[PDB]
Design an enzyme around this catalytic site. Structure first.
Site, PDB file in Angstrom:
ATOM      1  N   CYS C   7      27.713  59.485  25.890  1.00  0.00           N
ATOM      2  CA  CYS C   7      27.934  60.530  24.903  1.00  0.00           C
ATOM      3  C   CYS C   7      28.904  61.601  25.378  1.00  0.00           C
ATOM      4  O   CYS C   7      29.274  62.473  24.586  1.00  0.00           O
ATOM      5  CB  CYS C   7      26.598  61.178  24.520  1.00  0.00           C
ATOM      6  SG  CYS C   7      25.738  61.976  25.897  1.00  0.00           S
ATOM      7  N   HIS C 241      22.315  65.385  23.203  1.00  0.00           N
ATOM      8  CA  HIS C 241      23.267  64.489  22.561  1.00  0.00           C
ATOM      9  C   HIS C 241      24.537  65.273  22.252  1.00  0.00           C
ATOM     10  O   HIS C 241      24.544  66.130  21.364  1.00  0.00           O
ATOM     11  CB  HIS C 241      22.661  63.887  21.295  1.00  0.00           C
ATOM     12  CG  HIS C 241      23.666  63.284  20.365  1.00  0.00           C
ATOM     13  ND1 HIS C 241      24.583  62.338  20.771  1.00  0.00           N
ATOM     14  CD2 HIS C 241      23.892  63.484  19.045  1.00  0.00           C
ATOM     15  CE1 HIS C 241      25.333  61.986  19.743  1.00  0.00           C
ATOM     16  NE2 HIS C 241      24.934  62.666  18.684  1.00  0.00           N
TER      17      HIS C 241
HETATM   18  N1  LIG Z   1      23.326  62.903  27.518  1.00  0.00           N
HETATM   19  C1  LIG Z   1      23.513  61.469  27.372  1.00  0.00           C
HETATM   20  C2  LIG Z   1      24.186  61.092  26.054  1.00  0.00           C
HETATM   21  C3  LIG Z   1      23.264  61.279  24.851  1.00  0.00           C
HETATM   22  S1  LIG Z   1      21.757  60.278  25.030  1.00  0.00           S
HETATM   23  C4  LIG Z   1      21.123  59.808  23.395  1.00  0.00           C
HETATM   24  O1  LIG Z   1      21.988  59.095  25.860  1.00  0.00           O
HETATM   25  O2  LIG Z   1      20.733  60.975  25.812  1.00  0.00           O
END
Ligand SMILES: *NC[C@H](*)CS(C)(=O)=O
Ligand SMILES: COc1ncnc(C2CC2)c1-c1ncc2c(n1)n(Cc1ccc(-c3nc(C(F)(F)F)cn3C)cc1)c(=N)n2CC(F)(F)F
Ligand SMILES: [Zn+2]
Lengths: 75, 578, 296
Positions: C7, C241
């Site tokens: 992300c 996220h």
């Molecule tokens: N912080 C990691 C990306 C978003 S998630 C849904 O993997 O936690």
């Protein structure tokens, strides 16, 4: 020598670093004067992160140099 | 948080070394008090017929002296210093009488109400204490705090009748108080930069100020507003003096010029001669009207006496070219270097002179003369390594050596390496044993090796702050000195000097490989040769084996701790036979 | 196409793709490599993404991840860290050009640092290059105020005492910052975390216009329009996220309408509607983290 550090609030903190030490010693002094664990600090100089295991002569840090202090925000 | 320190100085210091910070005059006895950046206060004689003008000095401060005030008709003197202490002296004999330590940071201001006998002091800690002189000479005194403030105070003044006090700070806003009721009166604004000079009338009606911007303003205490503004100075004004009746003002600053500006009409201007250094804390001779002399101070060690005779009759060419009375000054140290073997120091001072100092014996062994510093440093190169165990401070223009608990006992040297006559000495332990030697607690029914000269001051100070004590090495066997020493010395000094506790040692690992061991730091490679020989047998050990480190053949006298620091860049060695 | 365990790299790539003069420059660097023999990976992803835009009018961002001792397995990392890593990997240009500028012009500037002793009034000037501005979000409520706090006259007092070699004593000094060279786009890094380890959920009113002339060294007349924002969504420094929204730069009716890159879904919003989201008028969940200000 004497160098400056900009903490989170924006204030300036003064260190006597003796430019022959490693990054871990500088982080230890920063934690002594700031109370932040050395495993969560991110030192940035001249738009480039300071990597551990190296001295300061390679980064040509001299006289009064400002090191920006930021943490790491994961996601 | 306690550091022991001592200085190296001559027995009789007769000339200024670093500069002058404040001046005072004693017309009753014709004496001049010079409180310079050097910790010593001197009493010169301003009589022209004295070819060697000097009287007893007063040496009790450990840092710069910022301002001195002559109180009680010249009987007593009050001095404020960088270390947060305000002392009381006896100007007739030049010995301290009391001390006040109720301050947190530097002290830079000092006032005096002659007709009221009051003294006020201000500092970088944003506090103002009102002190009564009459209860100071005769004596945990009471306090009278008068401070509603928000930033550091750099100058302060009080009127002659002791009814109005004005302070200048970094807000460019002057605050006015009232000593009797400790109330707030006014708030005078309209400056641009720091204010370092305030003068008030005898009745407190008018006030004169001079800012680092370079302008001089005339205020009014009957109307909360400024009246006139002059900008005759290109740079900031650091010194300010006025005539008796608020008619003329003498100014000077970083411009390195001294003017005499009129007040009724600012278009009359005469230029007194220009000094060679930034003029600060100008002083005036008020023997008669008009003042026939003026004493100036600078950043260099020299005090001059300019004469004013062309004023009021001059009808911009300088009025003077040379001073009338000159006071000589010495030379201060601006550079130092610690040799590879941490005992000697190479210092370079003004006028380009280099000297070779000692630390253990606390003396000077030789002066090298007019030679280049870099070539001299390169010539004096030793193939050893001793970890640093002290530090050198170049403030006050002299040598100051500070010992800290962290690394005072971090240097072990051999007996022959230290030069004495195998014992494994400790430099810090020997020094700390030598300093406190007249202390009766250290006696038993620098111990047996040398002796520090019996005039070196010993100072117990905090970490970059107030000094808890100040002692002479000779004067330690008395009653009051012992009483204060029983409580002022820290613990880690007592465990080493009073009791015989051996400080810890150091060890380092190193990998041996025929291309893990723990050994003391100052172990010669001669023993690593004798060890490998006697383990792998199937004079003789010296001749039949040689160790290689980074493919360099090792000399069988240089020890392990310098192999790591000068050849290796954990340590690893290699050995080959024959 | 974009599984939601990467992300940070996804958001950084989406923000960088819309930067001015980036997709054109990278094609040139690969063309030099093309006839001479990370750059080869970036050109591959750019070609694939541009194929999808034709349809609307599995992208596999893991190819860069494999090529880019801190990236092992499924973990959580920072966005500014990967941005700096990519901009540092892009070294390669200098090595290629020595044998005989996409970051030195896009993301690079210079500063001026002035220190003034309050005893002798002597100044000192130093030059330091900056790639981003770390700005304090709130003091221990405006972007201009925060930038002023970052770069203005500030006095070092107390234990933090300047050691002036003209006086050879521990004096008090004041410091200042000035801008000499401003890059094509200027990025601002918000120090949301508080030492008190924590996170402040009160955002700042980020303007859609900017002007750096009070803190500049020379008189200049140029503006700065916001064109990309990277936003967190968590409540602490352990997870969250990431989300990125980028303005459309230059299709017949989408111009002037902000995008919103959610998790595997592309949504088109309006400039007025978006401006009322990150503003503190309504308490939001997402907190802005980086702001990108394209010139003009
Ligand atoms: N912080 C990691 C990306 C978003 S998630 C849904 O993997 O936690
Ligand atoms: C590794 O991924 C990326 N790396 C770098 N950059 C990008 C994006 C474009 C910079 C992506 C990326 N990330 C997720 C995408 C993605 N690309 N695309 C392809 C697409 C198609 C049309 C448009 C578009 N353009 C306009 C215009 F022209 F009007 F502005 C309007 N719209 C909708 C944008 C993207 C897509 N569908 N998703 C969501 C899904 F794949 F999960 F489904
Ligand atoms: Zn200075």
């Amino acid at each position: 020598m004497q160098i400056f550090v900009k903490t989170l609030t924006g204030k300036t903190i003064t260190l006597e670093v003796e430019p022959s030490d490693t990054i871990e010693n500088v982080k230890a002094k920063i934690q002594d004067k700031e109370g932040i664990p050395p495993d969560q600090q991110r030192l940035i100089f001249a738009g480039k992160q300071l990597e551990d295991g190296r001295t300061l002569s390679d980064y040509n840090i001299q006289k009064e140099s400002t090191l920006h202090l930021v943490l790491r925000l994961r996601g | 948080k306690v550091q022991v320190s001592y200085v190296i100085r001559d027995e009789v210091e007769k000339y200024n070394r670093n500069g002058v910070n404040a001046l005072q005059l004693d017309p009753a006895l014709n004496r001049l008090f010079t409180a310079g950046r050097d910790s010593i206060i001197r009493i010169w004689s301003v009589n022209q017929h004295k070819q060697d003008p000097y009287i007893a000095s007063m040496e009790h401060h450990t840092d710069w002296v910022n301002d001195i005030v002559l109180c009680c008709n010249g009987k007593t003197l009050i001095s404020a210093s960088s270390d947060t202490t305000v002392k009381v002296w006896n100007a007739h004999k030049g010995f301290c009488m009391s001390t006040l330590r109720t301050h947190k940071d530097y002290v830079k201001a000092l006032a005096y109400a002659k007709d009221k006998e009051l003294v006020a002091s201000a500092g970088l800690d944003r506090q103002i204490f009102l002190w009564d002189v009459n209860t100071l000479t005769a004596l945990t005194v009471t306090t009278s705090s008068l401070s509603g403030n928000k930033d550091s105070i750099y100058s302060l003044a009080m009127n002659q009748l002791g009814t109005i006090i004005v302070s200048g700070s970094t807000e460019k806003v002057l605050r006015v108080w009232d000593p009797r009721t400790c109330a707030k009166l006014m708030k005078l604004k309209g400056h641009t930069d720091n204010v370092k000079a305030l003068l008030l009338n005898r009745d407190g009606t008018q006030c004169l100020s001079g800012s680092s911007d370079g302008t001089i303003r005339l205020w009014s205490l009957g109307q909360q507003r400024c009246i006139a503004t002059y900008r005759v100075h290109d740079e900031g004004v650091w010194a300010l003096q006025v005539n008796d009746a608020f008619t003329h003002v003498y100014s000077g600053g970083r411009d390195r010029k001294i003017y005499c500006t009129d007040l009724r009409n600012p278009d009359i201007r005469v230029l007194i001669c220009e000094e060679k250094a930034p003029v600060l804390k100008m002083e005036l001779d008020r023997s008669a009207d008009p003042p026939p002399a003026i004493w100036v101070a600078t950043t260099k060690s020299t005090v001059n006496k300019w004469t004013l005779k062309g004023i009021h009759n001059f009808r911009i060419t300088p009025l003077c070219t040379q001073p009338d009375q000159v006071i000589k000054g010495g030379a201060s140290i601006i550079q130092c270097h610690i040799l590879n073997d941490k005992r000697h120091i190479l210092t370079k001072d003004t006028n380009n002179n280099v000297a070779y100092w000692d630390v253990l014996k606390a003396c000077k062994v030789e002066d090298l003369g007019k030679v280049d510093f870099e070539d001299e440093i390169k010539k004096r190169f030793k193939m050893v390594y001793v970890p640093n165990w002290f530090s050198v401070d170049l403030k006050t223009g002299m040598l100051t050596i500070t010992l800290d608990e962290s690394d005072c006992f971090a240097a072990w040297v051999s007996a022959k390496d230290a030069g004495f006559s195998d014992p494994k000495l400790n430099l810090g332990g020997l020094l700390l044993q030598a300093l406190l030697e007249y202390w009766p607690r250290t006696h038993v029914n620098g111990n047996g090796y040398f002796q520090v000269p019996p005039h070196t001051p010993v100072i117990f100070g905090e970490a970059g702050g107030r000094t808890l004590f100040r002692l002479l090495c000779r004067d330690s066997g008395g009653e009051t000195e012992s009483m204060l020493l029983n409580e002022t010395v820290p613990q880690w000094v007592i465990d080493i000097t009073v009791d015989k506790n051996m400080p810890k040692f150091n060890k380092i690992p190193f990998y041996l490989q025929p291309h893990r061991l723990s050994a003391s730091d100052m172990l010669q490679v001669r023993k690593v040769m004798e060890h490998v020989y006697e383990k792998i047998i199937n004079v003789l050990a010296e001749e039949k084996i040689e160790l290689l480190c980074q493919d360099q053949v090792l000399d069988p006298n240089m020890d392990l701790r310098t192999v790591k620091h000068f050849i290796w860049k954990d340590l690893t060695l290699h050995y080959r036979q024959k | 196409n974009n599984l939601g365990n990467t992300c940070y790299l996804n958001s950084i790539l989406q923000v960088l793709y819309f930067c001015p003069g980036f997709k054109s420059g990278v094609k040139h660097l690969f063309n030099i490599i093309s006839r001479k023999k990370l750059i080869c990976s970036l050109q591959s992803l750019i070609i694939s993404v541009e194929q999808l835009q034709a349809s609307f009018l599995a992208t596999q961002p893991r190819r860069l991840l494999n090529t880019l001792p801190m990236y092992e397995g499924y973990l959580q990392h920072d966005a500014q860290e990967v941005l700096q890593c990519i901009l540092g990997n892009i070294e390669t240009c200098q090595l290629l050009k020595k044998e005989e500028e996409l970051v030195e012009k896009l993301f690079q500037g210079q500063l001026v640092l002035r220190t003034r002793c309050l005893e002798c009034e002597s100044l000192t000037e130093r030059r330091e290059d900056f790639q981003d501005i770390s700005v304090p979000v709130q003091e221990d409520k405006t972007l201009r105020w925060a930038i002023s706090q970052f770069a203005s006259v500030e006095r070092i007092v107390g234990e933090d005492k300047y050691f002036c070699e003209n006086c050879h004593h521990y004096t008090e000094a004041e410091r200042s910052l000035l801008f000499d060279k401003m890059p094509e786009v200027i990025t601002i890094h918000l120090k949301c975390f508080a030492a008190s380890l924590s996170k402040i959920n009160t955002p700042l009113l980020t303007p859609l216009k900017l002007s750096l002339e009070e803190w500049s060294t020379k008189p200049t007349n140029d503006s700065y329009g916001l064109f990309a924002v990277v936003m967190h969504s968590g409540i602490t420094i352990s997870s969250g996220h990431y989300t990125a929204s980028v303005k459309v730069t230059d299709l017949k009716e989408y111009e002037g309408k902000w995008l919103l890159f959610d998790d595997s879904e592309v949504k088109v919003t309006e400039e007025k509607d978006f401006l009322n989201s990150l503003s503190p008028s309504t308490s939001p969940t997402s907190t802005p983290y980086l702001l990108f200000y394209k010139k003009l």
